């Protein structure tokens, strides 16, 4: 595993206009901010 | 017919056309007059009513009724999304004369009676006094003339 590494998590902020079935030239100003976590990791209940 | 639809709409009603033409001279007859009222239209300034397209297309997405006349216009839609027109040089003695004002007030002219050559004017107008509303298919009519 020494020739495949991670070195940090990191987030991602990604925009966009709605979709072609959704467009009016008033709702192209209404952009979809987002975000989505890199290198992260999901878990189960805290032990603490 | 020269070179190498037949129904039309009217009060919610199709009526087909069974125009027939069987030779060939009345045809370009016609044909000289048609190209020849559509040349004399475009001017100087249809250079800077053409690079006014764009402007055409954002107020089609920005209003309502520029989307009913944007879509039946079988060239607009193409050009100002696939022709593009530079930035126009300047018109030769451009402080006295005025090209919008010729390039549209000789397609006034050349627009009435377009119609009334290839086809024919209007003679009589129906105007019942006290009679009916409307008048059936076969109904007489009370007109003055035009």
Known sequence: ?????AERTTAILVSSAPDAGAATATTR????YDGALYHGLIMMAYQA | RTAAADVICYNGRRYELETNLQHRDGSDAAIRTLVLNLMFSINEGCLLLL?????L???????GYVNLLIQTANCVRETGQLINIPPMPRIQDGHRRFPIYETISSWISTSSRLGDTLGTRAILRVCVFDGPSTVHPGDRTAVIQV
């Open chain 1, 29 to 32: 100003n209404m952009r979809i």
């Open chain 1, 1 to 5: 595993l020494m020739g495949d590494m």
């Open chain 2, 51 to 55: 690079a006014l397209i764009p402007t």
């Open chain 2, 57 to 63: 297309l954002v107020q089609g997405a920005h209003d």
